[PDB]
């Protein structure tokens, strides 16, 4: 019943293209502006492509990108709501980046924690939480997207710089490894989109994180916010905070934690 006829869709503008398929902005039933994830016909199994839609069928939250429809016969289409400002990573790196200060950045973080706390409640794992997988809409609304690797808890290698070591090394993906990634996401926000562990290659990152290395407090980031990051990067997955706590901490941040915050030059 999520099924629609393919002639119901008009693809128009390209927005991006991954190496397992493409993403277009389109029109649904001639009335609704949508986004249409397409498949590169041969890159990966059609059933592997559709599992992303399988997952999105079960999830529904204001801070997760919403599934609209599916075409499950080749060529395959996953149809979702359209996000007008593109990826958070591009937004932070773009011309808006320099004007964002801590209050807009923390509010973006709160929204992401809200969507993820919902994922937490439903017993899903995302497994690719990072700023390139968050989408920005009107009024600085942020929604988590790309549930390509997401699954209910019962590829070959993951971006180690965002992945909790137990998950990178032994495949132990839990909501607490998503919490690890959220901490790394917090450093992307507070540095306006810089790659984590500047100057370190993947192996060096792995070796040092095992030996206890953690990224320092970014310039102008408050120590209370870097404390939060460090709790997210606790070696013991179960010492890591929940998203429910993270959501509430970030929504209340400027009253309960940093009530005397003054804007600086970049944050
Ligand atoms: N690679 C490429 C995939 C791309 C990544 C960006 C966030 C999720 C993955 N992606 C963007 C979308 C999308 N969905 C809805 N509105 C949008 N606007 C711009 C991109 C976009 C879906 N996937």
Numbering used by the authors: 259 to 412, 421 to 533
Sentences from the paper on this structure:
The structure of the c-Src is composed of a bi-lobed architecture (N-lobe and C-lobe) that is typical for protein tyrosine kinases. The ATP binding site of c-Src kinase is located at the folding cleft between the N- and C-terminal lobes, surrounded by the Hinge region, P-loop, Helix aC, and activation loop. In this paper, we investigate the structural basis for Ruxolitinib binding to a kinase, using c-Src kinase domain as a prototypical system.
To see how cancer drug Ruxolitinib interacts with a kinase, we determined the X-ray structure of c-Src in complex with Ruxolitinib to a resolution of 2.26 Å. There is well-defined electron density for Ruxolitinib in both c-Src molecules, which appears to be bound with full occupancy. Part of the activation loop (amino acids 412–423) exhibits no electron density, indicating this region is flexible. Ruxolitinib binds in the ATP-binding cavity of c-Src, with unambiguous electron density observed for the inhibitor. It is orientated such that the pyrrolopyrimidine rings point toward the hinge region, the cyclopentane ring points toward the C-lobe, while the propanenitrile group points toward the P-loop. The pyrrolopyrimidine rings form two hydrogen bonds with the main chain atoms of Met341, as well as a water-mediated interaction with Src gatekeeper residue Thr338. Besides the hydrogen bonds, Ruxolitinib also forms a number of van der Waals contacts with c-Src.
